[PDB]
């Protein structure tokens, strides 16, 4: 009635917690309840929608403006719009960032603190997470004008390396080599959009550059010294420069506004760590300028 | 041709080869085998939180010491994902890595509770729902809190109501300096979308 | 003769017996007020619009109301410019006299909507933005709208607010607490707080004594309420 | 016929006794008898009822009188019984407990010690040990009265914050609130009980206020530093005023007495674990009023 | 509800990575990625050949 | 004297110490406990091949 033992002798390793940064698998953490089958309910009547509210086909499908353009009679034709916004004209394709504003604070009398400052659209958010990327961008520019105001405005892909001007602190485009008659603009995918009654369009740019996925890196310490994965991270640039130059009469203003929106679908992501040289630090704006912000470091 | 306007909305498209769904398979089969869908699942992964965490010995702790903190930041999944959105539901996974100068002089244990959310630390009893790891035979200490509300969600960061959910209180003996890691539980989730605040990039602080 | 409870609105009695009540000898009709208009419920009551606010914008501009907003928020002081707040449904409730209609009640469940009634010359541009954001002074400070990008800040749930294009914008800003059925008595309620800002400066021309004038409203009315426990309080 | 090991290295964690405070799974403790088979028989001829006597459906559902009300011809109409009860006319709706009296000894010259000593219904025992509630009360309020004396009596609801008056060390409800004219009993739930032969009436409240679960901290450390527990745990008041003056000749007695039964249907718990700021004692009676009772701390 | 151990003792032996220098079998390498089921595609349009 | 532990990270091939972040898929051992780490790099990668 009490028979020896049958069963072979099981193998062994000692470790706690195998595995544990993996989404599935039964993980042995001791809930600290009164029923081990602890079920809370579905998601009915809790959150006010019906939208999954998480997938990266709503996340990353959520609109932003980018920019805010002044377009006006004494820009030229065939030349993209230089404001100082600085980027304005030349918008990067691609989902990851691409601008910085800079936060220059006091320390001694001789040394300073150059924080950078992200604008984030919720499709830059999304990616500053995950490491490479592969998604299908899209556009909706739309154009702020009156009843009064006509002419044909063009935005044309350009496929590979944007033009650039490396400074201490930033990187901005260059726009002389986008003038002219030095870059044409008749074998590049365009359209040529009509201000007489047509307003607005999106313009969807499916991902085309020789690598399964790109990366996002984007504005992340691109200056004079490291810009390498500024260059490996957009696949070119839209860039809107007018054909015929705005007509307007004197009642109305000289000045127009084209908001660039943005968006991307289709999203597919590659690893989940951030492969820029920092960890994901939200940037908390301080109570005043002479207060500074607590940085993340590399130790462990 | 009149004067007015219209709004006559154009979605007009690039490059046109084959359909987008169908390269994205193609392209993570060769390169990633792993298919990220659902920001859901990224809420299951305990993300380390902290480095250190130097205990003082025999002073129950609750979490919030740590959390308040840790928020701000958002170096992990759960306070990255905590701009993005308003409301959350689900318990806390707490997982303890042992990083102490162990000594032979003493038997080292580590205890966990429940307080309800804010409460400090003497405010509150012991006899609950109980937790005991020995960090000599087991450096990890695998810690679930549940979701026991008054309320059916709970926005971030109240008003002056307080102990409306729980959370965990921390316990041990000597003086045991740890690494924390976290995630939600099988039914955390966010809901009620908002748009994303800013991000920090480098601070190399050039002298001129 | 033993059992005489009977119930009105909310209220039971308990008597002894039925104490002999004597009525009407016939019920006939009088006065035609019932063919007049048919009677309109408190839950019809709280879903008529009321003006609440006039706001004229005129380019400009010495005042804030035609800063644009901000590409980047670098400091607390340099919050973002708006033009007006409203702190959902402390506002709506208060205004329209509903709030004299609404007492000895407890609970509610409503949801506000926003329609904006807009009204500008062909001869001036423009564009603004109407967002709402649930909890926005009860947050810690980094989560707000007024101190995130313009990015961040157009990410918020809204409408566009073009001049020439939209005359009317229809928004259904839902219930978005997490206590169930707003209180009322001792009412500290300021759940969703509403904002609207412009993203672009009016634009008109730069000689003056022209007056380009924009000139909105603002329209706001309940629906899906519930109105359940009675009480005998009320705030002011 | 011996061959070799075929099965994979089985992973490990050391934890003794994983998840000890749940009332399902398989536990590890060695029973010391002759049988591991060891079953004990069912309840039959044990307990000598039948009912199952452990159901919160059942424990919470014992009838306990919570107030002996002594109502007067002096006693004014339209104002609660102020008796020096003192909740009396005022009685929570709610599970857990409500009042507390305080045993004052004497430790040195200036010293003293001040335990809170509280009544127990059946109804709120079981709520002591839990942290969150929800139930649906009722209250069983009888008039004990003579053949002769009449009168209309009032019983409303009111759901929120309940009148109180913090004092040094306890909470008692203000009178000078509920009376008049100044807070009316025309738009509240009510009954209006007659003396004349009519004796009886249940009373029962369901749980509505604005939450899923209230809570149970009730009285415990209630005073003027620390009463946010207490507003946050009842949703309201019964109210005992009467319409109508109690009318008795000189030969019956002028007080009759109103007795206000207490117990919860429905009731369901959260958490097994005490809200309150210290362990669940049990008040034991001293013998001589001199000596004190031994206090549990919060050291492990 | 809470029945005691009815299941014999495990026998054991700690044996850490035992018998790694083989091509079969199930080995304990912790993968560090997102989904335990982390599969590569075929040999499809990969290599030149077939 | 000392409490010996281990960890494992990801970087991407070729970069230095420390032009990395450290929050990504992690691993740990106890090397009083457990001397082996079980450690399996996925392969994410930008192109489909890889040349030596």
Same mark, same amino acid.
């Given at each position: 009635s009490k028979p020896r033992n049958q069963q072979q002798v099981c193998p062994l390793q000692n470790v706690p917690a195998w595995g544990y940064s993996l989404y599935k698998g039964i993980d042995m953490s001791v809930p600290l309840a009164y029923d081990p089958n602890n079920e809370l309910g579905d998601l009915k009547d809790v959150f006010p929608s019906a939208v999954d509210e998480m997938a990266i086909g709503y996340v990353c499908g959520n609109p932003a403006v980018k920019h805010v353009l002044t377009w006006k009679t004494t820009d030229a034709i065939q030349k993209p719009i230089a404001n100082g916004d600085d980027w304005g004209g030349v918008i990067p394709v691609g989902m990851p960032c691409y601008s910085k504003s800079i936060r220059t604070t006091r320390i001694s009398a001789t040394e300073n603190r150059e924080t950078e400052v992200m604008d984030a659209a919720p499709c830059e958010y999304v990616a500053n997470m995950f490491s490479y990327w592969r998604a299908t961008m899209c556009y909706r520019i739309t154009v702020v004008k009156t009843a009064f105001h006509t002419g044909r405005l063009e935005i044309f892909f350009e496929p590979g390396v944007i033009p650039v001007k490396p400074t201490v602190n930033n990187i901005g485009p260059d726009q002389d080599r986008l003038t002219g008659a030095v870059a044409p603009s008749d074998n590049n995918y365009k359209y040529i959009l009509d201000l007489t009654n047509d307003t607005e369009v999106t313009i969807r740019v499916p991902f085309v550059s020789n690598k399964m996925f790109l990366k996002?890196? $984007?504005?992340?310490?691109?200056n004079s010294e490291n810009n390498w994965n500024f260059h490996e991270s957009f696949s070119g640039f839209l860039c809107i420069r007018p054909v015929t130059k705005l007509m307007a009469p004197?009642?109305?203003?000289?000045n127009v506004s084209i908001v660039v929106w943005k968006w991307a679908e289709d999203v597919v992501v590659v690893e989940?760590?951030?492969?820029?040289? $920092?960890?994901?630090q939200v940037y908390r704006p301080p109570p005043t300028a002479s207060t500074a912000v607590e940085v993340l470091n590399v130790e462990l | 041709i009149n004067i007015g306007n219209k709004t006559n909305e154009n979605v007009i498209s690039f490059?046109?080869?084959?359909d987008a769904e169908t390269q994205n398979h193609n392209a993570l089969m060769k390169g990633c085998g792993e298919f990220i869908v659902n920001?859901?699942?990224?809420?299951?992964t305990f993300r380390t939180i902290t480095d250190n965490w130097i205990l003082q010995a025999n002073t129950k702790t609750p979490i919030t010491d740590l959390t308040n903190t840790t928020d701000a930041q958002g170096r992990d999944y759960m306070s990255y994902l905590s701009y993005l959105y308003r409301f959350y539901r689900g318990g806390r996974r707490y997982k303890f890595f042992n990083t102490t100068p162990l000594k032979q002089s003493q038997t080292c244990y580590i205890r966990s509770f429940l307080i309800p959310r804010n409460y400090s630390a003497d405010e509150i009893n012991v006899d609950g729902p109980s937790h005991i790891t020995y960090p000599v035979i087991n450096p990890v200490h695998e810690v679930e809190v549940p979701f026991y509300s008054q309320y059916r969600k709970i926005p971030i960061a109240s008003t002056s109501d307080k102990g409306y959910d729980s959370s965990l209180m921390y316990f041990s003996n000597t003086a045991t300096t740890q690494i924390v890691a976290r995630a939600g539980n099988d039914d955390f989730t966010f809901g009620w979308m908002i748009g994303p605040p800013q991000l920090q990039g480098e601070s190399r602080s050039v002298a001129p | 003769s033993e059992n005489s409870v009977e119930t009105q609105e909310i209220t039971t009695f308990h008597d002894v017996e039925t104490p002999n009540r004597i009525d009407t000898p016939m019920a006939q009709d009088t006065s035609s007020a019932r063919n007049m208009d048919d009677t309109h419920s408190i839950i019809q009551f709280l879903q008529r619009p009321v003006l609440i606010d006039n706001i004229e914008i005129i380019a400009g501009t010495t005042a804030d109301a035609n800063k644009p907003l901000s590409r980047y928020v670098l400091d607390q002081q340099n919050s973002q410019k708006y033009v007006r707040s409203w702190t959902l449904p402390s506002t709506v409730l208060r205004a329209g006299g509903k709030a004299q209609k609404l007492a000895n009640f407890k609970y509610l469940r409503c949801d506000v909507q926003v329609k904006l009634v807009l009204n500008a010359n062909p001869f001036v541009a423009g564009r603004m933005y109407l967002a709402y954001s649930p909890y926005d002074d009860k947050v810690d400070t980094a989560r707000s709208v007024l101190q995130t990008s313009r990015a961040g800040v157009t990410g918020y749930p809204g409408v566009e607010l073009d001049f020439q294009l939209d005359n009317s914008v229809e928004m259904t800003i839902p219930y978005a607490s997490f206590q169930e059925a707003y209180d009322l008595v001792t009412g500290t309620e300021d759940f969703v707080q509403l904002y609207l800002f412009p993203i672009t400066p009016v634009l008109g021309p730069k000689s003056e004594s022209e007056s380009s004038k924009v000139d909105i409203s603002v329209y706001m009315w309940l629906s899906n309420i519930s109105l359940v426990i009675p009480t005998y309080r009320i705030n002011p």
């Amino acid at each position: 009635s009490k028979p020896r033992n049958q069963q072979q002798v099981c193998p062994l390793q000692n470790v706690p917690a195998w595995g544990y940064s993996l989404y599935k698998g039964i993980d042995m953490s001791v809930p600290l309840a009164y029923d081990p089958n602890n079920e809370l309910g579905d998601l009915k009547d809790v959150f006010p929608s019906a939208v999954d509210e998480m997938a990266i086909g709503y996340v990353c499908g959520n609109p932003a403006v980018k920019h805010v353009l002044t377009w006006k009679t004494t820009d030229a034709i065939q030349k993209p719009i230089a404001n100082g916004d600085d980027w304005g004209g030349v918008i990067p394709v691609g989902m990851p960032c691409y601008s910085k504003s800079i936060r220059t604070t006091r320390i001694s009398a001789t040394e300073n603190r150059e924080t950078e400052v992200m604008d984030a659209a919720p499709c830059e958010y999304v990616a500053n997470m995950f490491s490479y990327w592969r998604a299908t961008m899209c556009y909706r520019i739309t154009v702020v004008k009156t009843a009064f105001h006509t002419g044909r405005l063009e935005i044309f892909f350009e496929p590979g390396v944007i033009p650039v001007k490396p400074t201490v602190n930033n990187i901005g485009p260059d726009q002389d080599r986008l003038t002219g008659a030095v870059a044409p603009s008749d074998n590049n995918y365009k359209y040529i959009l009509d201000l007489t009654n047509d307003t607005e369009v999106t313009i969807r740019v499916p991902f085309v550059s020789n690598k399964m996925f790109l990366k996002t890196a $984007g504005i992340y310490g691109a200056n004079s010294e490291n810009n390498w994965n500024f260059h490996e991270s957009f696949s070119g640039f839209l860039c809107i420069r007018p054909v015929t130059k705005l007509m307007a009469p004197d009642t109305v203003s000289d000045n127009v506004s084209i908001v660039v929106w943005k968006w991307a679908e289709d999203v597919v992501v590659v690893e989940p760590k951030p492969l820029t040289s $920092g960890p994901t630090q939200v940037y908390r704006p301080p109570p005043t300028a002479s207060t500074a912000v607590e940085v993340l470091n590399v130790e462990l | 041709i009149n004067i007015g306007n219209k709004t006559n909305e154009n979605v007009i498209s690039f490059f046109d080869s084959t359909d987008a769904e169908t390269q994205n398979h193609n392209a993570l089969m060769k390169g990633c085998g792993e298919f990220i869908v659902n920001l859901r699942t990224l809420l299951r992964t305990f993300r380390t939180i902290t480095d250190n965490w130097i205990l003082q010995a025999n002073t129950k702790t609750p979490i919030t010491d740590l959390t308040n903190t840790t928020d701000a930041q958002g170096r992990d999944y759960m306070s990255y994902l905590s701009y993005l959105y308003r409301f959350y539901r689900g318990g806390r996974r707490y997982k303890f890595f042992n990083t102490t100068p162990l000594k032979q002089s003493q038997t080292c244990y580590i205890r966990s509770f429940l307080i309800p959310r804010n409460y400090s630390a003497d405010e509150i009893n012991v006899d609950g729902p109980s937790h005991i790891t020995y960090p000599v035979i087991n450096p990890v200490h695998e810690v679930e809190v549940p979701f026991y509300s008054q309320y059916r969600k709970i926005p971030i960061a109240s008003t002056s109501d307080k102990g409306y959910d729980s959370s965990l209180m921390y316990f041990s003996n000597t003086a045991t300096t740890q690494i924390v890691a976290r995630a939600g539980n099988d039914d955390f989730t966010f809901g009620w979308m908002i748009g994303p605040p800013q991000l920090q990039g480098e601070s190399r602080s050039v002298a001129p | 003769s033993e059992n005489s409870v009977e119930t009105q609105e909310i209220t039971t009695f308990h008597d002894v017996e039925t104490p002999n009540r004597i009525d009407t000898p016939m019920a006939q009709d009088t006065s035609s007020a019932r063919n007049m208009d048919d009677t309109h419920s408190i839950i019809q009551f709280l879903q008529r619009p009321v003006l609440i606010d006039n706001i004229e914008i005129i380019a400009g501009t010495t005042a804030d109301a035609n800063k644009p907003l901000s590409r980047y928020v670098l400091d607390q002081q340099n919050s973002q410019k708006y033009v007006r707040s409203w702190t959902l449904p402390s506002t709506v409730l208060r205004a329209g006299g509903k709030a004299q209609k609404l007492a000895n009640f407890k609970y509610l469940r409503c949801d506000v909507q926003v329609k904006l009634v807009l009204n500008a010359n062909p001869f001036v541009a423009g564009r603004m933005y109407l967002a709402y954001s649930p909890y926005d002074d009860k947050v810690d400070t980094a989560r707000s709208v007024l101190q995130t990008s313009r990015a961040g800040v157009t990410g918020y749930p809204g409408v566009e607010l073009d001049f020439q294009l939209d005359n009317s914008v229809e928004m259904t800003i839902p219930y978005a607490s997490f206590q169930e059925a707003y209180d009322l008595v001792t009412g500290t309620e300021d759940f969703v707080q509403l904002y609207l800002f412009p993203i672009t400066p009016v634009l008109g021309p730069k000689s003056e004594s022209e007056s380009s004038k924009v000139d909105i409203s603002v329209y706001m009315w309940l629906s899906n309420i519930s109105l359940v426990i009675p009480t005998y309080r009320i705030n002011p």
